[PDB]
Amino acid sequence: AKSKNHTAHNQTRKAHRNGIKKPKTYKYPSLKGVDPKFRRNHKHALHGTAKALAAAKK
Amino acid sequence: AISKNLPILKNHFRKHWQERVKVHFDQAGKKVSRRNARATRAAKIAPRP
Amino acid sequence: SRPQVTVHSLTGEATANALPLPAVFSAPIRPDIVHTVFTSVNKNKRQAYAVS
């Protein structure tokens, strides 16, 4: 009692019903996976930038 | 047997619970009987509290 | 709202005394709430039946 093993029939149609729309993009992407040295530096630089901006517009 | 995201339930109903079911239809009757027994005991011990 | 309501006497059309409304008569009218509560209490007054 053998049966059909595999097929890609109807798969593209099923995908394209409500499918291949592009993923949504963001400003300020996640900083995970980037160099942790750069992460520490960016954290300190952002803190300093916020402090300086508050000082500039008190 | 297991399905989509649901809490795992532990329902202990693998015995003859249908034989061991007690439904309290006699709540009102028991309350009435308890009040009646209290009144009867009060009458029997009429001066006692 | 409702200023006063008179009192009907068995000895005539009315009397001198009148009283204000207890504001329970000014409480809101909720037909849906009344319907649900009445359904539930009408079920409350019931008796059990079963086959052998």
Binding site: - | A1, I2, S3, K4, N5, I8 | -
Partner: protein, 148 residues
Amino acid sequence: PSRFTKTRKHRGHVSAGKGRIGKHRKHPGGRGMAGGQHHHRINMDKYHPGYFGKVGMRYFHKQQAHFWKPVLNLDKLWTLIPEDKRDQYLKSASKETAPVIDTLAAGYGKILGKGRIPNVPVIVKARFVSKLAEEKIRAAGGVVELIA
């Protein structure tokens, strides 16, 4: 409300909404949590991770009476004091008249300093205290005295 069920809407249709090919059989996948490690492993791993195995140590004869310790935050403490006098102490915040709050009488075994009580001095009576709760109470001007 049996008249609202889909059983009344399936009257006339052959399969009663259960399909003609894969019928409504009795127990096609098992009974209960059958095969949670064999054929329901996918569901268990997706939705109930950590289901299988044992981790901690055991505790024979455990007692929730032993482990009873409700927690109270500082804002909830100042609202725990009665309101009709709460206004009075809040206005006349001063020492030698600070209210005594018995968190144990209210039913709390521990106080936690979740933040920003007013500067009204207040005597606090609790079974256990937190570091930050004690510091915040003293900054407000009151004190925490331990009870049992």
